[PDB]
């Protein structure tokens, strides 16, 4: 089948392609940015201070 969705085990939520979905922080105060670049759920972390 096609592969564009993004299964996130951090919450068990699936997303579409190029769809961005933020995840809670770990213990500090940063936000987890996770978006689907093709089906591998791309991600990065950008703190609130900017």
Domains of the chain: 1-50 (2.10.70.10)
Give the contacts of 46 (CB within 8 A, at least 6 positions apart): 30, 31, 33
Q: Which experiment gave this structure?
A: NMR
**Cβ neighbour number for residue 39 with a 10 Å cutoff:** 13
The helix/strand/coil state of 41 is coil
Give the whole-angstrom CA distance, residue 26 versus residue 5.
Answer: 24
The helix/strand/coil state of 17 is coil
39: left (phi over 0), alpha (psi -120 to 50) or beta: left
CB-hemisphere CA count at 13 Å for 12? 0
Q: Tell me the helix, strand and coil percentages in the chain, rounded to 5.
A: 0, 40, 60
């Amino acid at each position: 089948s096609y592969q564009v969705i993004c299964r996130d085990e951090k919450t068990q939520m699936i997303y579409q392609q190029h769809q961005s979905w933020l995840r809670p922080v770990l213990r500090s105060n940063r936000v987890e940015y996770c978006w689907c670049n093709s089906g591998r759920a791309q991600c990065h972390s950008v703190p609130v201070k900017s």
